[PDB]
Design a protein around this ligand. Sequence first.
Ligand code: A1LZM
Ligand code: A1LZM
Ligand code: A1LZM
Ligand code: A1LZM
Ligand code: A1LZM
Ligand SMILES: C/C=C1/c2cc3[nH]c4c(c3C)C(=O)[C@H](C(=O)OC)c4c3nc(cc4[nH]c(cc(n2)[C@@H]1C)c(C(C)=O)c4C)[C@@H](C)[C@@H]3CCC(=O)OC/C=C(/C)CCC[C@H](C)CC/C=C(\C)CCCC(C)C
Ligand code: HEC
Ligand code: HEC
Ligand SMILES: [Fe+3]
Lengths: 275, 346, 28, 62, 62, 62, 318, 63, 63, 63, 63
Amino acid sequence: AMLDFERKYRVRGGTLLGGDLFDFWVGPFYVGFFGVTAIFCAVFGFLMIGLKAAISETWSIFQLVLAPPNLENGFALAPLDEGGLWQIVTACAIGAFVSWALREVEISRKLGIGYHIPFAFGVAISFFVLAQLGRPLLLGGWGHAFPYGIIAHLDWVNNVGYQNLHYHYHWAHMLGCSLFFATSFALALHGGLILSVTNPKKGEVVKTAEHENTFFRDFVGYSIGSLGIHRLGLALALSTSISCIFGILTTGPFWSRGWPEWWYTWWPQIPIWNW
Amino acid sequence: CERPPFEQEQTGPRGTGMYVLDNPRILESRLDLHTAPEARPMASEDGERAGDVHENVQVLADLSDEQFWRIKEEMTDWVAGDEGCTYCHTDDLASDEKYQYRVSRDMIEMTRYLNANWADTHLTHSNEAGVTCYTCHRGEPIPPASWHSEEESGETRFMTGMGDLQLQNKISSKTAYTAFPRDALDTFLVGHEGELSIVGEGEGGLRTATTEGVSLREAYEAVGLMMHLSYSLDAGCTLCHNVSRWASWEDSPKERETAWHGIRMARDINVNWINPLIDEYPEDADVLGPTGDVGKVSCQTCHNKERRPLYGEEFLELYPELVGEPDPDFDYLQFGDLGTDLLKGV
Amino acid sequence: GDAGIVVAVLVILAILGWPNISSTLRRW
Amino acid sequence: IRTGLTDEECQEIHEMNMLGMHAYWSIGLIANALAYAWRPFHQGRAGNRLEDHAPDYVRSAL
Amino acid sequence: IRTGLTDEECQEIHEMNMLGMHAYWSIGLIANALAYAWRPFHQGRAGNRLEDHAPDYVRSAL
Amino acid sequence: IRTGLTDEECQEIHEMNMLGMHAYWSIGLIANALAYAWRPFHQGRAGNRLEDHAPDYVRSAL
Amino acid sequence: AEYQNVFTRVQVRGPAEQGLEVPGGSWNRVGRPRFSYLLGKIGDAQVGPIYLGATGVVASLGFLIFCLMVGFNWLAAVDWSVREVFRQFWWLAVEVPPPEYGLRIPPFNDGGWFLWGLAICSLSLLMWWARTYIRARALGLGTHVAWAFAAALWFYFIITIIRPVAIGSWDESLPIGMFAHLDWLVAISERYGNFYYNPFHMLSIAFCFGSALLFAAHGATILATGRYNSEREIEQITDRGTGSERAALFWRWTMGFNATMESIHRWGYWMAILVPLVASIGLFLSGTVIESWYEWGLKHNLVPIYEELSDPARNPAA
Amino acid sequence: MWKLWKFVDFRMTAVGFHLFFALLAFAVHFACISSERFNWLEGAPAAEYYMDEDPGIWKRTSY
Amino acid sequence: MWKLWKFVDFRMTAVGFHLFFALLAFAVHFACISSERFNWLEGAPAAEYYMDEDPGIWKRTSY
Amino acid sequence: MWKLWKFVDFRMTAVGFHLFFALLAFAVHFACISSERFNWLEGAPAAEYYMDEDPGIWKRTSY
Amino acid sequence: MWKLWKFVDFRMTAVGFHLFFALLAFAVHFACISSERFNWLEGAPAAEYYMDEDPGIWKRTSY
Ligand code: A1LZM
Ligand code: A1LZM
Ligand code: A1LZM
Ligand code: A1LZM
Ligand code: A1LZM
Ligand SMILES: C/C=C1/c2cc3[nH]c4c(c3C)C(=O)[C@H](C(=O)OC)c4c3nc(cc4[nH]c(cc(n2)[C@@H]1C)c(C(C)=O)c4C)[C@@H](C)[C@@H]3CCC(=O)OC/C=C(/C)CCC[C@H](C)CC/C=C(\C)CCCC(C)C
Ligand code: HEC
Ligand code: HEC
Ligand SMILES: [Fe+3]
């Protein structure tokens, strides 16, 4: 139940908050106080999701949604049957994500590694927070935040995108879709490169960093290298999450017309070609 | 760049994203464009008929003299612009030398028809508004949001050459500045063969052996028309839809239904009233479009980037002389849906 | 007609270009 | 750059290549002759569009 | 940069290259001559559009 | 910097380069002469738009 | 704070490495290796040399021919005004054939240029894939990069050729335009129900979001464990060090399970290349098997049902 | 051309021709399918069924 | 130019010419299909079928 | 220019010139295709077919 | 300026100038095609065809 080398690192300390009381492992998982709070928020939020499934009679992961209150509700606490369950689960999700990231900070301290992983997770959490708080603050109510349904939040994404007519044309959407595609492209390239170096044809020896460098130099003229590929990957995925922040915070709050009309508003009128 | 706050209208269930944000500052900036002029005082119906005290009066013959003068002054304030009476009139006030005179005669007929027949289904959705001359013209001879056929549907096509966008892939307010087909206004607000119900249905959501849908190009054209609808009403797709289920009328806000009639009404306006005006126009008139066509009526023509024309100002009671008698055989399904009986000439 | 000439030429080319016949012109 | 093949290996590969290319070439030529006799690939000056020769009731994809 | 090929290797490469280039060239010239005799590639001053020469009932994709 | 080629290698590269460029130049000049005699590339003052010369039932896609 | 392994503050330059010996490398490796200090901040500074292979050169030439066909069509669309091309750069496109041709290759200006460019672009992409394969093989590498490109190209061929052919119409294919191919996205999703209700769309987005997740997490993991030379991952795979151990233990203590230095790349490789693969499956089923993803997910209890609206819109056409 | 395998890898040449010919066989079969005259699957008539004489290919026919 | 292979890799040149000629054969065949006169797949008539005189190519014909 | 190959790589010069001339041949054929006068695939008439006189190029003709 | 190659790489300069001049020839030929007067592909008339006098360039002509 423990890795061949795991016990060698399973030491006390590294906790941000929890001391030695929560500083232990249950099976593979390190717990920590932030693990305790993450489990609390996760299980309570899932129990509120089940409560909405019960009250809405929607026992389908796909059809069940915790939607935020109505727009007329504003920032007020809603009835649990009118968006209050969504508010509870929003608090639970923020708490669980923050607790998970802080538990990862604890694990990083215990392993002596940098806090890059909880930082990247915190970038994703920052998207969630700015989407579920920043968009309500910009637009004046919890009802502008996306709901909690496996399929229904896709419907919210659909409707919020089509509120600006053609959401593809959103500048933040264009940049962020390019960034997601570049992230999957670079993950494919990087996994393929590492596996190609370490899994050549049968009978061939494992190649080196020189091999992979000259592979991408021969291939596309540039090789970003071992450190560069991971730096670029963290950058690409993070930047796509920041692009998601900008997209969710600008569609509506900072452009209520169509994003096609947004593009028409400035690009065709750029004076170097508007004549 | 835009800015909060916004006038919000939740058009669907909470959390679905079905709401419309309208910029209050933008509506304030378009307030001059979106408000009809102060109405003239009501004119008495008692008096000599306008067809008796004037030589060449036919469309307004059944009007009293005072009602006639009221509506003439209002039409001057609504279509004449800065040209005034001379816009439609020569030195002789009973002579139709100017095409504007006869076109305005047909326009009075069309406004009467619209207020008599399209009020129950489209023109009085929120308010007993109806339409006046100002609803489209907005004080100008040419309605600012009148549309012509694109200067690619009428051009000679170089079939084996280069650079044919197929009425797409170009900047146009007619598609809300999308790359969607620009001739969608011709396809749907003039033509009747166009299919707007582009979303697949199948059976069980499946392309059954009996399932026949529209082509992807027909989907392009319909989505372009829908972009025009959204542009015209200054709202998103959520104004009339849960975009997740476009084909579902039960999941769509009521504004879809009236929008439907608007589509047909535009077709009506274009087929029975606007296009037959081409005979009245001079052959080389500068007002005519690049394809030599009269400017047609679209959603934007009355919805000049506004949810309801002229802030839903009521004109049916305010201008009874612009309200005609209901057409005995009027049927909103006879504009290319159940048939083409009411689309004259097609 | 002309289709006959085309078919005959294609058949003749297949016969001449068949490996058993085309290889007779192999020179190394 | 050189492939390292000997003269004998190159000649063996070339015999196999001549067999493959020319067998495929003859089979394809016979196939195209058969398809050409079925329906000549190239229209005459009159063309071979159904709309220009068939009656109106004969549907054509145009 | 130098490919390292000897004069004799370059000459056998060039023998094959001349063979392939000129055989493809002659076959293509014959193919283009056949397609030109079928339908001349370049129109006269009158052109060769069907609309300008065919009756009205002959549909033209142009 | 320097490519490292000797004078003789540069001279034979230039022989082949002169041959290639000038053979292509002459073939292109002949081809452009043929295409120019077919249809002069440059219009006169009257132009060569069909709409300005054709009897106006001739379709001009211009 | 500690060094975050985000930028290389001190770059070192050796002799410009032409590359490991490959057949034809001495001739086909072109370009004096140039060192970008800006690129050296993140990764390797060296730019070039590039392999000037037959597949690479002809694929790049075909890409250029395709781009120039698109540009010439855009010019002829805007009366050969480069000014109007740049003004309408995002809107302009080489449009696909209309449905009345079906699978017929139409005249150039009725979608024939699109099919011409599709042939050129597809052949160029296949030559580029061949270059990927051959560049990997010449270095004694696995062809994993070639097969990731093959997954992406399989999706591309589904978008452009295979699925338009199966549907039987070229108008289903992707227009060559910035805004036009996004309009293709909208048209495909709305014509065929809703791709939000397409489970292969769901899975492809799961794998794209998870490519971002894994590649953020993996880049962060490698930058965090770069204190222990974990960025030299080939060594950590053949000679597992404390950096790979710490990465595995971080993820095991977080998630309960971890990967290895090689298996994390297996995970990321498959998570990435699954995006175009299940994407191709879902797109192909859209219009061949599935007519409406909304109706199909309604039958499968996948589509949520929301509160019935007060005063719904009634279809006036019954 | 037997000297070609002194300089061009035969294995890659044959693999590339087989791959390209699979691709091209698909492309050419599709080109036949796209033509109603040649789409055997749809099975449309040939215009020669309705012609009074042989159209030819080079026959220099006149209307 | 038999000396070109002293300075130009013949393997690249031959394989690249084959690749580019596959690409160009597709380009040119597609160009012919995109032409009504030259689309053998659609089989449109030639204008020479309806012309009473040879149009020529360089023949200085006049209307 | 025989000394240019002492300083300029004939490899890249020749390869890039062939690649660019392929691209330019396509570009020029596209320019001809886009021209009604010069599209041989369209086969439009030359205006000279309808002019009663030689337009010239530098002929300095007058209406 | 023969000493410029002591400080400025001639290969870089020549390659960059040829690349820029390819792009510039494309751009300038495009400028001509954009111009109605200079578009030989469309072949529009010159206004000098309808002028009864030389317009000049620097000539102080008055309407
Ligand atoms: C009509 C309409 C429409 C739309 C809509 C819209 C809107 C409104 C928006 C959007 C978006 C976008 N998108 Mg889209 N769309 C379209 C489409 C598309 C396409 C195609 C192909 O077509 C593409 C590719 C695209 C993509 C995209 C991207 C980019 C983005 C997304 C991503 C995100 O965000 O997430 C982000 C997210 C995130 C970060 C998340 C995080 C978690 C957390 C912490 C974690 C944790 C959790 C949990 C639960 C735990 C678990 C446990 C275990 C399991 C045990 N698109 C259409 C058009 N759009 C956004 C933005 O903007 O960005 C920029 C927004 O806002
Ligand atoms: C309808 C239907 C159809 C078809 C069909 C099919 C399928 C399905 C397939 C095929 C094929 C194939 N083809 Mg064919 N075709 C067709 C036509 C044709 C042509 C024309 C011209 O037209 C050609 C030339 C061909 C050819 C061929 C090859 C290339 C391949 C095989 C290879 C071989 O070896 O043979 C073999 C080879 C052979 C045949 C070749 C040869 C030369 C000769 C002597 C000379 C020439 C000429 C020219 C070009 C001029 C003329 C024209 C004019 C106008 C008078 N194809 C049609 C249209 N397909 C295959 C493939 O691709 O694989 C890959 C397949 O699968
Ligand atoms: C309709 C249809 C058609 C066709 C068809 C086809 C197909 C399908 C194919 C082809 C080809 C090919 N072609 Mg041909 N054509 C056509 C025309 C032409 C022309 C003109 C002029 O137009 C040219 C120049 C050509 C040429 C050629 C080559 C380059 C290639 C290769 C082959 C050879 O080698 O031959 C060989 C070569 C040859 C034939 C050539 C040579 C010089 C000569 C003596 C002289 C020159 C002149 C000039 C340019 C100017 C005149 C014009 C004017 C306007 C008067 N193509 C038509 C349009 N295709 C191929 C390819 O691409 O490969 C890849 C293919 O597949
Ligand atoms: C075996 C061996 C061999 C060879 C070799 C060799 C050597 C040594 C050399 C050469 C060459 C060569 N080529 Mg070759 N080849 C072969 C083949 C071939 C073929 C086939 C397919 O068969 C072909 C087609 C070929 C082509 C060529 C060309 C590219 C070149 C020439 C160029 C000229 O001349 O110019 C000349 C020309 C001139 C000066 C004139 C200029 C203009 C420019 C830009 C233009 C610009 C313009 C623009 C951009 C605008 C346009 C307009 C429109 C509106 C858009 N190859 C074989 C393989 N080769 C040269 C060069 O590169 O230079 C540098 C040299 O030296
Ligand atoms: C329509 C139709 C057309 C055409 C057609 C075609 C095709 C298809 C092709 C071609 C070509 C080519 N061209 Mg040509 N063209 C055309 C014209 C022209 C021109 C004018 C001026 O216009 C030029 C300058 C050219 C030129 C050339 C070259 C560069 C190349 C060849 C190479 C050589 O070397 O030759 C050879 C060369 C040559 C021919 C040339 C050179 C200088 C000379 C002496 C002198 C100059 C002068 C000037 C500029 C002045 C103007 C005046 C007026 C009055 C304003 N192109 C038309 C428009 N294409 C090719 C290419 O690109 O390849 C890449 C191809 O493919
Ligand atoms: C730019 C960087 C990114 C990035 C980076 C990164 N993400 C990381 C790490 C790093 C570095 C981790 O280190 C961490 C980990 O341990 O696994 C590898 C983690 C993780 N992310 C996960 C999901 C993920 N992430 C996504 C996006 C990115 N992730 C972006 C692209 C996406 C989407 C949609 O794109 C998803 C679904 C989990 C698997 C895991 C957290 C577990 C947790 O929160 O515990 C807490 C434990 C649980 C069970 C949470 C339950 C909490 C509430 C009460 C349950 C209800 C859930 C909601 C209300 C959410 C909305 C529902 C939608 C339907 C509307
Ligand atoms: C175009 C929109 C008009 C403007 C502006 C004005 N008039 Fe007009 N007028 C117009 C029409 C089409 C008609 C015919 C009405 C009918 O029922 O057929 C008229 C009618 C008159 C008349 C009576 C004609 C007659 O028989 O003598 C008069 C006297 C008249 N109009 C005057 C008039 C004045 C003074 C205006 C400016 C304030 C004016 N008209 C504006 C069309 C249009
Ligand atoms: C919208 C449905 C309209 C109403 C209501 C009225 N008019 Fe109109 N009118 C409309 C359009 C789209 C056009 C064509 C504009 C174009 O682009 O060509 C017109 C045209 C006229 C004209 C002629 C304009 C001109 O060429 O100068 C006149 C004189 C006119 N309309 C008068 C008119 C009057 C008097 C109306 C009220 C009774 C009226 N119109 C209503 C659209 C609409
Ligand atoms: Fe890695």
